[PDB]
Amino acid sequence: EVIKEFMRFKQHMEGSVNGHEFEIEGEGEGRPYEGTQTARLKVTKGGPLPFAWDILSPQISKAYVKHPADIPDYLKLSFPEGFKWERVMNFEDGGVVTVTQDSSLQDGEFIYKVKVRGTNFPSDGPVMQKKTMGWEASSERMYPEDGALKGEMKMRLRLKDGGHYDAEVKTTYMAKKPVQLPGAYKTDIKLDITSHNEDYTIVEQYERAEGRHS
């Protein structure tokens, strides 16, 4: 079986937010059938970033989602060739992030390449002023459509001030081969930033994700 109980990944991310270009490299590890993983990220070009790390954190791994045996695990089944995903996050204040991502399995390790584009964040808003404080737990509504797997969710970012800053998120996950699509279900996800240096040029994260019937 190509996906072992323990799997590492390597990751390259590039992109721009509000005109600022960056690159990040990461390495992570986790237990795909348990839905858990951690990663060490570092900003390798464009640091320090003048925006909140938190808009980048959900772009850093859906092979690590626990599934019950009766929900086909389309994204695990796609390996070793892998899958691609594309996402839009529409933030409440008009900011937008679009993502394209490629996922493959090479010599026992997952390989991620991510391209992130964000724009129209207000300069006095919480993203450009770095006033965010991590994501509340999300529930992604998963469903087959057009021969792909889609996910929808409202994600909420905590704010330094006590409130929240929300995004509507839409993602399309497309396996490189037509492995078995599931029926509709939900995935419970919680992502934590477990360590960072002051300017977030060195960051660690943890995520747990588990699918269940809806």
Side-chain angles (χ1 to χ4, degrees), residues 4-44 46-112 114-130 132-160 162-173:
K4 313 304 190 203
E5 290 218 85
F6 176 79
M7 296 290 282
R8 293 184 182 270
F9 70 78
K10 299 315 160 240
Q11 171 173 68
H12 169 77
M13 169 188 291
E14 48 183 82
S16 60
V17 180
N18 278 30
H20 188 98
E21 289 265 333
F22 63 91
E23 302 183 352
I24 286 160
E25 274 178 17
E27 59 81 13
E29 71 202 83
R31 294 171 190 165
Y33 304 91
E34 300 307 314
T36 50
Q37 53 185 313
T38 54
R40 281 55 56 191
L41 299 319
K42 83 178 141 177
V43 174
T44 49
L49 307 170
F51 57 84
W53 182 261
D54 285 331
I55 61 165
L56 303 183
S57 64
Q59 328 314 338
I60 289 293
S61 184
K62 291 292 198 163
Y64 298 78
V65 176
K66 179 173 191 188
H67 283 72
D70 62 336
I71 302 180
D73 195 340
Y74 179 67
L75 299 178
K76 280 189 184 67
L77 290 161
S78 75
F79 286 100
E81 210 189 345
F83 66 98
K84 285 196 119 283
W85 64 262
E86 310 194 324
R87 177 168 287 164
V88 56
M89 308 175 76
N90 284 293
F91 294 86
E92 70 183 53
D93 64 351
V96 171
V97 23
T98 53
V99 187
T100 56
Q101 201 267 15
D102 194 285
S103 295
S104 56
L105 201 167
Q106 297 170 202
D107 185 31
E109 290 190 18
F110 294 116
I111 309 304
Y112 299 157
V114 203
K115 300 177 178 174
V116 173
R117 295 287 177 195
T119 188
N120 197 38
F121 291 96
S123 66
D124 58 359
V127 165
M128 304 307 302
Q129 289 287 319
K130 301 182 205 170
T132 69
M133 302 186 71
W135 290 103
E136 307 289 16
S138 306
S139 285
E140 194 177 0
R141 167 180 91 83
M142 307 305 293
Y143 57 100
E145 185 187 81
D146 307 314
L149 175 62
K150 304 205 154 50
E152 185 165 15
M153 48 192 164
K154 182 167 193 186
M155 290 181 55
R156 300 199 93 159
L157 253 179
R158 300 184 277 278
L159 264 7
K160 245 134 227 135
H164 297 97
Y165 175 66
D166 293 344
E168 293 291 353
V169 182
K170 295 138 180 254
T171 311
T172 300
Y173 308 89

Side-chain angles (χ1 to χ4, degrees), residues 178-198:
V179 292
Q180 185 178 20
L181 280 161
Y185 72 104
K186 276 265 183 167
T187 303
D188 295 311
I189 305 159
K190 186 182 178 17
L191 184 166
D192 298 323
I193 305 304
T194 60
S195 180
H196 58 89
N197 65 352
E198 188 173 273

